[PDB]
Amino acid sequence: KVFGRCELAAAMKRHGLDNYRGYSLGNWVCAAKFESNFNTQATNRNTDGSTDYGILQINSRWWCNDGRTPGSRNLCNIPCSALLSSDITASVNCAKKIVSDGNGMNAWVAWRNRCKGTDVQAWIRGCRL
Ligand SMILES: [Cl-]
Ligand SMILES: [Cl-]
Ligand SMILES: [Cl-]
Ligand SMILES: [Cl-]
Ligand SMILES: [Cl-]
Ligand SMILES: [Cl-]
Ligand SMILES: [Cl-]
Ligand SMILES: [Cl-]
Ligand SMILES: [Cl-]
Ligand SMILES: [Cl-]
Ligand code: NA
Ligand SMILES: [Ru+3]
Ligand SMILES: [Ru+3]
Ligand SMILES: [Ru+3]
């Protein structure tokens, strides 16, 4: 599923991401925009052999099991395919764990390089929230 901008904002808010660990909703929408272009089915292989999955490009090196990342962890206790569903629940619950691990949203390279420090509220402009 490719979410609309405000559609994703509403889903993220319902699932408790607005201000989670102090990160306003616009930060999360911006991260999803540049990680996946709002496409739940996005997958990208990393040089180390891990793969990033879903709207927030969550990495199999630590967070989910894909059966093909030797020596990796599965800290969200989910198959990586669960991060590709049209229902964003699994991605949100796992993102909450990632952002709580100590480094905040810096875990998302696209957030650090393209969202951090910017006017992220623009990503929720016009949305009925
Ligand atoms: Cl579409
Ligand atoms: Cl559409
Ligand atoms: Cl929309
Ligand atoms: Cl859009
Ligand atoms: Cl719309
Ligand atoms: Cl957009
Ligand atoms: Cl846009
Ligand atoms: Cl594995
Ligand atoms: Cl933080
Ligand atoms: Cl990234
Ligand atoms: Na894994
Ligand atoms: Ru469309
Ligand atoms: Ru729209
Ligand atoms: Ru758009």
Coordinates of N, CA, C and O and ligand atoms in Angstrom, one line a residue:
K1 N 0.8 -1.2 0.0 CA 0.0 0.0 0.0 C 0.9 1.2 0.0 O 1.8 1.3 0.8
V2 N 0.6 2.2 -0.9 CA 1.2 3.5 -0.8 C 0.3 4.5 -0.1 O -0.8 4.8 -0.7
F3 N 0.6 4.9 1.1 CA -0.2 5.8 1.9 C -0.2 7.2 1.3 O 0.8 7.6 0.7
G4 N -1.3 7.9 1.4 CA -1.2 9.4 1.3 C -0.5 10.0 2.5 O -0.5 9.3 3.6
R5 N -0.1 11.2 2.4 CA 0.6 11.9 3.5 C -0.3 12.0 4.7 O 0.1 11.6 5.8
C6 N -1.5 12.6 4.6 CA -2.3 12.7 5.7 C -2.9 11.4 6.2 O -3.2 11.2 7.4
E7 N -3.1 10.4 5.3 CA -3.6 9.1 5.7 C -2.6 8.5 6.6 O -2.9 7.9 7.6
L8 N -1.3 8.5 6.3 CA -0.3 8.0 7.1 C -0.2 8.7 8.4 O 0.0 8.1 9.5
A9 N -0.3 10.0 8.4 CA -0.2 10.8 9.6 C -1.3 10.3 10.6 O -1.1 10.2 11.8
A10 N -2.5 10.1 10.1 CA -3.6 9.7 10.9 C -3.4 8.3 11.5 O -3.7 8.0 12.7
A11 N -2.9 7.4 10.7 CA -2.6 6.1 11.1 C -1.5 6.1 12.2 O -1.6 5.4 13.2
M12 N -0.5 6.8 12.0 CA 0.6 6.9 13.0 C 0.1 7.5 14.3 O 0.5 7.1 15.4
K13 N -0.8 8.5 14.2 CA -1.3 9.1 15.4 C -2.2 8.1 16.2 O -2.0 8.0 17.4
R14 N -3.1 7.4 15.5 CA -3.9 6.4 16.2 C -3.1 5.4 16.9 O -3.4 4.9 18.0
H15 N -1.9 5.0 16.3 CA -1.0 4.0 16.9 C 0.0 4.5 17.9 O 0.8 3.8 18.3
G16 N -0.2 5.8 18.3 CA 0.6 6.4 19.4 C 2.0 6.9 19.1 O 2.8 7.0 20.0
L17 N 2.3 7.2 17.8 CA 3.6 7.7 17.5 C 3.8 9.2 17.7 O 4.9 9.7 17.8
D18 N 2.7 10.0 17.7 CA 2.7 11.4 17.9 C 3.4 11.8 19.2 O 2.8 11.5 20.3
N19 N 4.5 12.4 19.2 CA 5.3 12.7 20.4 C 5.9 11.5 21.1 O 6.3 11.7 22.3
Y20 N 5.9 10.4 20.5 CA 6.6 9.2 21.1 C 8.0 9.4 21.3 O 8.7 9.8 20.3
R21 N 8.6 9.2 22.5 CA 9.9 9.5 22.8 C 10.3 11.0 22.5 O 11.5 11.3 22.2
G22 N 9.3 11.9 22.5 CA 9.5 13.3 22.2 C 9.5 13.7 20.8 O 9.8 14.8 20.5
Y23 N 9.2 12.8 19.8 CA 9.3 13.0 18.4 C 7.9 13.3 17.9 O 7.1 12.4 17.8
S24 N 7.7 14.6 17.4 CA 6.4 15.0 16.9 C 6.0 14.2 15.7 O 6.9 13.6 15.0
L25 N 4.7 14.2 15.4 CA 4.2 13.4 14.3 C 4.9 13.7 12.9 O 5.2 12.8 12.1
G26 N 5.2 15.0 12.7 CA 5.9 15.4 11.5 C 7.2 14.7 11.3 O 7.7 14.4 10.1
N27 N 8.0 14.5 12.4 CA 9.2 13.7 12.3 C 9.0 12.3 11.7 O 9.8 11.9 10.9
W28 N 8.0 11.7 12.2 CA 7.7 10.3 11.7 C 7.2 10.3 10.3 O 7.6 9.4 9.5
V29 N 6.4 11.2 9.9 CA 5.9 11.3 8.5 C 7.1 11.6 7.6 O 7.3 11.0 6.5
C30 N 8.0 12.5 8.0 CA 9.1 12.9 7.2 C 10.1 11.6 7.0 O 10.6 11.4 5.9
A31 N 10.3 10.9 8.1 CA 11.1 9.7 8.0 C 10.5 8.7 7.1 O 11.3 8.2 6.2
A32 N 9.2 8.5 7.1 CA 8.6 7.5 6.2 C 8.7 8.0 4.8 O 8.9 7.2 3.9
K33 N 8.5 9.3 4.6 CA 8.6 9.8 3.2 C 9.9 9.5 2.6 O 10.0 9.0 1.4
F34 N 11.0 9.7 3.3 CA 12.3 9.5 2.7 C 12.9 8.1 2.8 O 13.7 7.7 2.0
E35 N 12.3 7.3 3.8 CA 12.7 5.9 3.8 C 12.1 5.1 2.8 O 12.7 4.2 2.2
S36 N 10.8 5.3 2.5 CA 10.0 4.4 1.7 C 9.1 5.1 0.7 O 8.4 4.4 -0.1
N37 N 9.0 6.4 0.7 CA 8.0 7.2 -0.1 C 6.6 6.7 0.2 O 5.7 6.7 -0.6
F38 N 6.4 6.3 1.5 CA 5.1 5.9 2.0 C 4.6 4.6 1.5 O 3.4 4.2 1.7
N39 N 5.5 3.8 0.9 CA 5.2 2.5 0.4 C 5.4 1.4 1.4 O 6.6 1.1 1.7
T40 N 4.4 0.7 1.9 CA 4.6 -0.3 2.9 C 5.4 -1.5 2.3 O 5.9 -2.3 3.1
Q41 N 5.4 -1.7 1.0 CA 6.0 -2.9 0.4 C 7.5 -2.6 0.1 O 8.2 -3.6 -0.4
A42 N 8.1 -1.5 0.4 CA 9.4 -1.2 0.1 C 10.4 -2.1 0.8 O 10.3 -2.3 2.0
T43 N 11.4 -2.6 0.0 CA 12.5 -3.4 0.6 C 13.8 -3.0 -0.1 O 13.8 -2.7 -1.3
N44 N 14.9 -3.0 0.7 CA 16.2 -2.6 0.1 C 17.3 -3.4 0.8 O 17.3 -3.4 2.0
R45 N 18.1 -4.0 0.0 CA 19.2 -4.8 0.5 C 20.4 -3.9 0.9 O 20.8 -3.0 0.2
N46 N 21.0 -4.2 2.1 CA 22.1 -3.5 2.6 C 23.4 -4.2 2.2 O 23.4 -5.4 1.9
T47 N 24.5 -3.5 2.2 CA 25.8 -4.1 1.8 C 26.2 -5.3 2.7 O 26.9 -6.2 2.2
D48 N 25.8 -5.2 4.0 CA 26.2 -6.3 4.9 C 25.4 -7.6 4.7 O 25.6 -8.6 5.4
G49 N 24.4 -7.6 3.8 CA 23.5 -8.7 3.6 C 22.2 -8.6 4.3 O 21.3 -9.5 4.0
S50 N 22.0 -7.7 5.2 CA 20.7 -7.5 5.8 C 19.8 -6.7 4.8 O 20.3 -6.3 3.7
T51 N 18.6 -6.6 5.1 CA 17.6 -6.0 4.3 C 16.7 -5.1 5.2 O 16.4 -5.4 6.3
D52 N 16.3 -3.9 4.6 CA 15.4 -3.0 5.3 C 14.0 -3.2 4.7 O 13.8 -3.3 3.5
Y53 N 13.0 -3.1 5.6 CA 11.6 -3.5 5.2 C 10.6 -2.4 5.6 O 10.6 -2.0 6.8
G54 N 9.7 -2.1 4.7 CA 8.5 -1.4 5.0 C 8.6 0.1 5.1 O 9.6 0.7 4.6
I55 N 7.6 0.7 5.6 CA 7.4 2.2 5.5 C 8.5 2.9 6.2 O 8.9 4.1 5.9
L56 N 9.1 2.3 7.3 CA 10.2 2.9 8.0 C 11.5 2.1 7.8 O 12.5 2.3 8.6
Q57 N 11.6 1.2 6.8 CA 12.9 0.6 6.4 C 13.6 0.0 7.6 O 14.8 0.3 7.8
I58 N 12.9 -0.8 8.3 CA 13.4 -1.5 9.5 C 14.3 -2.6 9.1 O 14.0 -3.4 8.3
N59 N 15.5 -2.7 9.8 CA 16.6 -3.5 9.3 C 16.6 -4.9 10.0 O 16.5 -5.0 11.2
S60 N 16.8 -6.0 9.2 CA 16.9 -7.3 9.7 C 18.1 -7.7 10.5 O 18.1 -8.7 11.1
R61 N 19.1 -6.8 10.4 CA 20.3 -7.0 11.2 C 20.0 -7.1 12.7 O 20.7 -7.9 13.4
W62 N 19.0 -6.4 13.2 CA 18.7 -6.3 14.6 C 17.2 -6.6 14.9 O 16.9 -7.1 16.0
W63 N 16.3 -6.3 14.0 CA 14.9 -6.0 14.5 C 13.9 -7.0 14.0 O 12.9 -7.1 14.7
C64 N 14.1 -7.7 12.9 CA 13.1 -8.7 12.5 C 13.9 -9.9 11.9 O 15.1 -9.8 11.5
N65 N 13.2 -11.0 11.7 CA 13.7 -12.2 11.1 C 13.3 -12.3 9.7 O 12.1 -12.4 9.4
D66 N 14.3 -12.4 8.8 CA 14.0 -12.8 7.4 C 14.7 -14.1 6.9 O 14.6 -14.4 5.8
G67 N 15.3 -14.8 7.9 CA 15.9 -16.1 7.6 C 17.2 -16.0 6.7 O 17.7 -17.1 6.3
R68 N 17.7 -14.8 6.3 CA 18.8 -14.8 5.4 C 19.8 -13.7 5.9 O 20.6 -13.2 5.0
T69 N 19.8 -13.4 7.2 CA 20.8 -12.4 7.7 C 21.6 -13.1 8.8 O 21.3 -12.9 10.0
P70 N 22.6 -13.9 8.5 CA 23.3 -14.7 9.5 C 23.8 -13.8 10.6 O 24.4 -12.7 10.5
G71 N 23.7 -14.4 11.9 CA 24.2 -13.7 13.0 C 23.3 -12.5 13.5 O 23.7 -11.8 14.4
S72 N 22.2 -12.3 12.9 CA 21.4 -11.1 13.2 C 20.5 -11.4 14.4 O 20.3 -12.6 14.8
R73 N 19.8 -10.4 14.9 CA 18.9 -10.5 16.0 C 17.5 -10.3 15.4 O 17.3 -9.9 14.2
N74 N 16.5 -10.5 16.3 CA 15.1 -10.3 15.9 C 14.4 -9.6 17.1 O 13.5 -10.2 17.8
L75 N 14.8 -8.4 17.5 CA 14.4 -7.8 18.7 C 13.0 -7.4 18.7 O 12.4 -7.2 19.8
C76 N 12.3 -7.2 17.6 CA 10.9 -6.9 17.5 C 10.1 -8.2 17.5 O 8.8 -8.1 17.5
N77 N 10.7 -9.4 17.5 CA 10.1 -10.7 17.5 C 9.0 -10.8 16.5 O 7.8 -11.2 16.7
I78 N 9.4 -10.5 15.2 CA 8.4 -10.6 14.1 C 9.2 -11.0 12.8 O 10.4 -10.8 12.7
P79 N 8.5 -11.7 11.9 CA 9.0 -11.9 10.6 C 9.1 -10.5 9.9 O 8.2 -9.7 10.0
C80 N 10.2 -10.3 9.1 CA 10.3 -9.0 8.4 C 9.1 -8.8 7.5 O 8.8 -7.6 7.2
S81 N 8.5 -9.8 6.9 CA 7.4 -9.7 6.1 C 6.2 -8.9 6.7 O 5.4 -8.3 6.1
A82 N 6.1 -9.1 8.1 CA 5.1 -8.3 8.8 C 5.2 -6.8 8.6 O 4.2 -6.1 8.8
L83 N 6.4 -6.3 8.4 CA 6.6 -4.9 8.2 C 6.2 -4.4 6.8 O 6.4 -3.3 6.5
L84 N 5.7 -5.3 5.9 CA 5.3 -4.9 4.6 C 3.8 -4.9 4.4 O 3.3 -4.5 3.3
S85 N 3.1 -5.2 5.5 CA 1.6 -5.2 5.5 C 1.0 -3.8 5.2 O 1.6 -2.8 5.5
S86 N -0.2 -3.8 4.6 CA -0.9 -2.6 4.5 C -1.3 -2.0 5.9 O -1.5 -0.8 6.0
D87 N -1.4 -2.8 6.9 CA -1.6 -2.4 8.3 C -0.3 -2.1 8.9 O 0.6 -3.0 9.0
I88 N -0.1 -0.9 9.4 CA 1.2 -0.4 9.8 C 1.5 -0.8 11.3 O 2.5 -0.4 11.8
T89 N 0.6 -1.5 12.0 CA 0.8 -1.8 13.4 C 2.2 -2.4 13.7 O 2.8 -2.0 14.6
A90 N 2.6 -3.4 12.9 CA 3.9 -4.1 13.2 C 5.0 -3.1 13.1 O 5.9 -3.1 13.9
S91 N 5.0 -2.3 12.0 CA 6.0 -1.3 11.8 C 6.1 -0.3 12.9 O 7.1 0.1 13.4
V92 N 4.9 0.2 13.4 CA 4.9 1.2 14.5 C 5.4 0.6 15.7 O 6.2 1.2 16.4
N93 N 4.9 -0.6 16.1 CA 5.4 -1.2 17.4 C 6.9 -1.5 17.4 O 7.5 -1.3 18.4
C94 N 7.4 -1.9 16.2 CA 8.9 -2.1 16.2 C 9.6 -0.8 16.2 O 10.6 -0.6 16.9
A95 N 9.1 0.2 15.5 CA 9.8 1.6 15.5 C 9.8 2.1 16.9 O 10.8 2.8 17.3
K96 N 8.8 1.9 17.7 CA 8.8 2.3 19.1 C 10.0 1.7 19.9 O 10.6 2.4 20.7
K97 N 10.3 0.5 19.6 CA 11.4 -0.2 20.3 C 12.7 0.4 19.8 O 13.6 0.7 20.6
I98 N 12.8 0.6 18.5 CA 14.1 1.2 17.9 C 14.4 2.6 18.5 O 15.5 2.9 18.9
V99 N 13.4 3.5 18.4 CA 13.6 4.8 18.9 C 13.8 4.9 20.4 O 14.3 6.0 20.8
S100 N 13.5 3.9 21.1 CA 13.8 3.8 22.6 C 15.1 3.2 22.9 O 15.4 3.1 24.1
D101 N 15.9 2.9 21.9 CA 17.1 2.1 22.3 C 18.3 3.0 22.7 O 19.4 2.4 23.1
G102 N 18.2 4.3 22.6 CA 19.3 5.2 23.1 C 19.7 6.3 22.1 O 20.1 7.3 22.5
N103 N 19.5 6.0 20.8 CA 19.9 7.0 19.8 C 18.8 7.7 19.1 O 19.0 8.5 18.2
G104 N 17.6 7.5 19.7 CA 16.4 8.2 19.1 C 16.2 8.0 17.7 O 16.5 6.9 17.2
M105 N 15.8 9.0 16.9 CA 15.5 8.8 15.5 C 16.7 8.8 14.7 O 16.6 8.6 13.4
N106 N 17.9 9.0 15.2 CA 19.1 8.9 14.5 C 19.3 7.4 13.9 O 20.2 7.3 13.0
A107 N 18.6 6.5 14.4 CA 18.6 5.1 13.8 C 18.2 5.1 12.4 O 18.7 4.3 11.6
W108 N 17.4 6.1 11.9 CA 17.0 6.2 10.6 C 17.9 7.2 9.8 O 17.8 8.5 10.1
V109 N 18.7 6.7 9.0 CA 19.7 7.6 8.3 C 19.0 8.7 7.5 O 19.4 9.8 7.5
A110 N 17.9 8.3 6.8 CA 17.2 9.3 6.0 C 16.6 10.4 6.9 O 16.6 11.6 6.5
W111 N 16.2 10.1 8.2 CA 15.7 11.1 9.1 C 16.9 12.0 9.5 O 16.7 13.3 9.4
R112 N 18.0 11.5 9.8 CA 19.1 12.3 10.3 C 19.6 13.2 9.1 O 19.8 14.4 9.4
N113 N 19.6 12.7 7.9 CA 20.2 13.5 6.8 C 19.1 14.4 6.1 O 19.6 15.4 5.5
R114 N 17.8 14.2 6.3 CA 16.9 14.9 5.5 C 15.7 15.5 6.3 O 15.0 16.3 5.8
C115 N 15.5 15.1 7.6 CA 14.4 15.6 8.4 C 14.9 16.3 9.6 O 14.3 17.4 10.0
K116 N 15.9 15.8 10.3 CA 16.4 16.4 11.5 C 16.7 17.9 11.4 O 17.5 18.2 10.4
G117 N 16.2 18.7 12.2 CA 16.4 20.1 12.2 C 15.6 20.9 11.2 O 15.7 22.1 11.2
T118 N 14.8 20.2 10.4 CA 14.0 20.9 9.4 C 12.6 21.2 9.9 O 12.2 20.8 11.0
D119 N 11.8 22.0 9.2 CA 10.4 22.3 9.5 C 9.5 21.1 9.3 O 8.8 21.0 8.3
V120 N 9.6 20.1 10.2 CA 8.9 18.8 10.0 C 7.4 18.9 10.1 O 6.7 18.1 9.6
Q121 N 6.9 20.0 10.7 CA 5.5 20.2 10.8 C 4.8 20.4 9.4 O 3.6 20.1 9.3
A122 N 5.6 20.8 8.4 CA 5.1 20.9 7.1 C 4.5 19.5 6.6 O 3.6 19.5 5.8
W123 N 5.1 18.4 7.1 CA 4.6 17.1 6.7 C 3.2 16.8 7.1 O 2.5 15.9 6.5
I124 N 2.6 17.5 8.1 CA 1.3 17.2 8.6 C 0.4 18.4 8.2 O -0.8 18.5 8.7
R125 N 0.9 19.4 7.5 CA 0.1 20.6 7.1 C -1.2 20.2 6.4 O -1.1 19.3 5.5
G126 N -2.3 20.8 6.8 CA -3.6 20.6 6.1 C -4.3 19.3 6.6 O -5.5 19.2 6.4
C127 N -3.6 18.4 7.3 CA -4.2 17.2 7.7 C -5.2 17.4 8.9 O -4.9 18.2 9.8
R128 N -6.3 16.7 8.8 CA -7.4 16.8 9.9 C -6.9 15.9 11.0 O -7.3 14.7 11.0
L129 N -6.2 16.5 12.0 CA -5.7 15.7 13.1 C -6.2 16.3 14.4 O -6.0 15.7 15.5
Ligands
CL1 CL -0.9 4.5 -4.9
CL2 CL -3.5 6.3 -3.6
CL3 CL -4.3 11.5 2.4
CL4 CL 1.2 11.7 -0.8
CL5 CL -6.6 12.3 0.1
CL6 CL 4.1 13.4 0.0
CL7 CL 3.9 15.7 -1.3
CL8 CL 18.5 -14.7 9.8
CL9 CL 16.0 11.6 21.6
CL10 CL 18.1 5.7 6.6
NA11 NA 17.3 -10.7 11.9
RU12 RU -2.0 6.5 -5.5
RU13 RU -4.2 12.9 0.4
RU14 RU 2.8 12.8 -2.1

